[PDB]
Amino acid sequence: APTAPSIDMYGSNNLQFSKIELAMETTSGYNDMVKYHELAKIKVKFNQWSGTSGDTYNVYFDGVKVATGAITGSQTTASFEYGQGGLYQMEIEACDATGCSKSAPVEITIADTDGSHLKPLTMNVDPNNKSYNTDPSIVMGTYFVEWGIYGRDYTVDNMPVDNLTHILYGFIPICGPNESVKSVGGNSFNALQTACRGVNDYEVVIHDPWAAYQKSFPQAGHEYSTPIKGNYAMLMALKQRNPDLKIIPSIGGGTLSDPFYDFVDKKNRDTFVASVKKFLKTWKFYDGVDIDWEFPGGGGAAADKGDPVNDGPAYIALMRELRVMLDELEAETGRTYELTSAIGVGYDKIEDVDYADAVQYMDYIFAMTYDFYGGWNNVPGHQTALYCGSFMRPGQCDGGGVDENGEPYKGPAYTADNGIQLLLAQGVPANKLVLGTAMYGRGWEGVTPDTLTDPNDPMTGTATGKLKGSTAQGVWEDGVIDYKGIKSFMLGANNTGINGFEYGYDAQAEAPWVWNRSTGELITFDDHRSVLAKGNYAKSLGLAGLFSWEIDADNGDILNAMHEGMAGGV
Numbered sequence: 163a164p165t166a167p168s169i170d171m172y173g174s175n176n177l178q179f180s181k182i183e184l185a186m187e188t189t190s191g192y193n194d195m196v197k198y199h200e201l202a203k204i205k206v207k208f209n210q211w212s213g214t215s216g217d218t219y220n221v222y223f224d225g226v227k228v229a230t231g232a233i234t235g236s237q238t239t240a241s242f243e244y245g246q247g248g249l250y251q252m253e254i255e256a257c258d259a260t261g262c263s264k265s266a267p268v269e270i271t272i273a274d275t276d277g278s279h280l281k282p283l284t285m286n287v288d289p290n291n292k293s294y295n296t297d298p299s300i301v302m303g304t305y306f307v308e309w310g311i312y313g314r315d316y317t318v319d320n321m322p323v324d325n326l327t328h329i330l331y332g333f334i335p336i337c338g339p340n341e342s343v344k345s346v347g348g349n350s351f352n353a354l355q356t357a358c359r360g361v362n363d364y365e366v367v368i369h370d371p372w373a374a375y376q377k378s379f380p381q382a383g384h385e386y387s388t389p390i391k392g393n394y395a396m397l398m399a400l401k402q403r404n405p406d407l408k409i410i411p412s413i414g415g416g417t418l419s420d421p422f423y424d425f426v427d428k429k430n431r432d433t434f435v436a437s438v439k440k441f442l443k444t445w446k447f448y449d450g451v452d453i454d455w456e457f458p459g460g461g462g463a464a465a466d467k468g469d470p471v472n473d474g475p476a477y478i479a480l481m482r483e484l485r486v487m488l489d490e491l492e493a494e495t496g497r498t499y500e501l502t503s504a505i506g507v508g509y510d511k512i513e514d515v516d517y518a519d520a521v522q523y524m525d526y527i528f529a530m531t532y533d534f535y536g537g538w539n540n541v542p543g544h545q546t547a548l549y550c551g552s553f554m555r556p557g558q559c560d561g562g563g564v565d566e567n568g569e570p571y572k573g574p575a576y577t578a579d580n581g582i583q584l585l586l587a588q589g590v591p592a593n594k595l596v597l598g599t600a601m602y603g604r605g606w607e608g609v610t611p612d613t614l615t616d617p618n619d620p621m622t623g624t625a626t627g628k629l630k631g632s633t634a635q636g637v638w639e640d641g642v643i644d645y646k647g648i649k650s651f652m653l654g655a656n657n658t659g660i661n662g663f664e665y666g667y668d669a670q671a672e673a674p675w676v677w678n679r680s681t682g683e684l685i686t687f688d689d690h691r692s693v694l695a696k697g698n699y700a701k702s703l704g705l706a707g708l709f710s711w712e713i714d715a716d717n718g719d720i721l722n723a724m725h726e727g728m729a730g731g732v
């Protein structure tokens with residue numbers, strides 16, 4: 163017999179609540195910005211402008227009582243806690259000693275990081291991506307990068323999810339030594355320094371919280387009060403659409419690897435592994451963890467770091483300790499968690515780790531069968547070839563021979579096959595190895611006909627420096643160009659060459675190129691034919707499947723060719 167409560171929507175934060183508390187309007191240290199709570203704090207103001215207020219209120223969700231408290235005037239704030247994500251029909255009743263009066267029902271939101279409060283994501287995929295029916299048991303993986311939402315304008319809803327079994331989210335940094343990040347320039351180091359304020363060394367943080375959970379995406383139905391936004395809310399909604407899709411954070415990468423060189427100290431491993439556990443309990447759409455340590459024993463971005471004696475055993479013990487933690491999470495959640503790793507495959511990288519030992523703890527190894535050659539020097543070669551190319555010298559392929567100075571090769575050439583063979587030779591099972599495809603080229607300038615030793619092979623020439631180009635042509639950094647830019651501005655619709663470029667293919671290597679004779683611009687990449695070769699290769703050997711870097715730089719062609727190659731292998 164009190165007046166029925168009316169809910170004050172705007173005074174109740176629009177009925178948007180959350181188990182995760184996220185700072186939306188600042189950029190600060192990770193522990194300040196991100197706090198996960200077992201119970202969402204709910205706060206609901208309601209009014210009873212006319213008649214009497216009564217003396218007690220009860221809150222209902224879906225007809226079930228979840229809170230009570232005192233009414234003592236014409237305006238009440240109900241605060242209480244609720245543990246479960248989702249959308250519920252809320253009613254609030256006011257009672258006095260003679261009876262109760264319920265508000266009409268209204269939808270309350272409680273966000274959780276599994277995406278339980280979200281609709282399946284609405285997609286906007288380039289239709290050049292085709293439909294396939296590839297055995298769901300074969301891995302088809304790709305990397306999606308956090309920074310691709312800026313100039314590259316490639317957002318979660320753009321991924322051809324149905325053609326993917328695995329999404330690797332690049333990249334998650336680690337607080338601590340990160341000089342390599344500083345040397346890259348731009349805002350990347352400053353952002354990391356900010357994320358790590360008030361955070362212990364060796365713990366993971368979100369690099370760019372604006373990209374991750376702050377930016378409002380209209381295509382996803384984000385609004386001012388949406389408690390989770392950015393790439394991560396879209397990934398949560400993506401899981402709603404494709405529940406068997408694995409989405410896995412990728413920790414480190416080429417530039418963010420400096421902290422791994424201190425994993426020789428188990429205290430630092432303990433810290434890291436703990437932080438990875440809390441990360442996965444905070445961000446529940448994620449299905450495991452991927453370790454991109456580039457690289458045990460060194461020879462990566464960090465010129466002053468790398469220990470060929472101890473890095474490999476640190477890596478193995480890291481994998482065991484991650485697997486122990488993941489087993490805890492599988493026990494507590496009833497879910498399956500995956501442990502994976504992307505690795506260098508030059509002989510000199512592989513030799514510093516006993517992967518037969520490491521892989522017993524692991525689901526997959528992502529074999530980085532790319533970046534074999536590039537604009538970091540002036541020696542052209544195939545950046546992502548399966549086999550040894552025609553430009554290689556005698557004894558260069560297997561490492562038997564001597565270079566153009568008479569100096570012995572130190573080991574087998576950088577090719578996919580040499581890398582996979584070396585891993586198989588250590589005792590890694592083929593069904594745990596994933597072969598990598600390139601959705602980008604690397605290239606040079608100044609490789610003109612007078613530099614060649616074989617007039618029909620630009621891979622026999624000498625360059626002057628790195629390919630240069632504009633972002634409109636897909637060149638986001640010197641020496642590197644998106645596949646989709648190669649296709650638009652060098653190959654042309656027919657794959658025969660435009661704007662001064664010709665196409666060529668090294669059949670021995672299984673690697674294409676596009677070469678401009680007068681500028682001497684040369685670009686090495688993966689195309690439809692080299693990718694069919696790689697799918698046939700993976701199939702012959704019983705490899706787990708294929709993966710790619712990076713999804714934003716494809717137009718549909720590379721991923722299509724990945725599915726076609728895995729069907730068509732003879």
Ligand SMILES: Cc1cc(N)c2ccccc2[n+]1CCCCCCCCCC[n+]1c(C)cc(N)c2ccccc21
Pocket residue numbers: 285286287288289290291292293321322323324325
């Ligand atoms: C793209 C996409 C776009 C949507 N509006 C969409 C809407 C609802 C559900 C899925 C959706 N997905 C698909 C979700 C991504 C999975 C990746 C497989 C890509 C299949 C794209 C489907 N496709 C479309 C729609 C239109 C075409 N003319 C075409 C022409 C040739 C081939 C395919 C083609």
Ligand SMILES: Cc1cc(N)c2ccccc2[n+]1CCCCCCCCCC[n+]1c(C)cc(N)c2ccccc21
Pocket residue numbers: 189309312349350353369370372638
């Ligand atoms: C537009 C905009 C709008 C806002 N309201 C805003 C608000 C706060 C902060 C930034 C904001 N921004 C934009 C600021 C973006 C920089 C902040 C995040 C730094 C993370 C660095 C990673 N990373 C980046 C970024 C770019 C790359 N090419 C790259 C290439 C290779 C490897 C890594 C790479």
Ligand SMILES: Cc1cc(N)c2ccccc2[n+]1CCCCCCCCCC[n+]1c(C)cc(N)c2ccccc21
Pocket residue numbers: 416461462463464465533536538
């Ligand atoms: C591997 C590596 C990777 C880096 N990102 C890097 C960055 C800065 C300095 C050295 C670097 N090193 C190598 C450090 C020197 C020890 C090895 C002797 C010469 C090999 C240099 C190779 N190399 C260079 C120079 C630059 C690159 N961007 C590059 C990118 C991918 C793969 C290789 C690359």
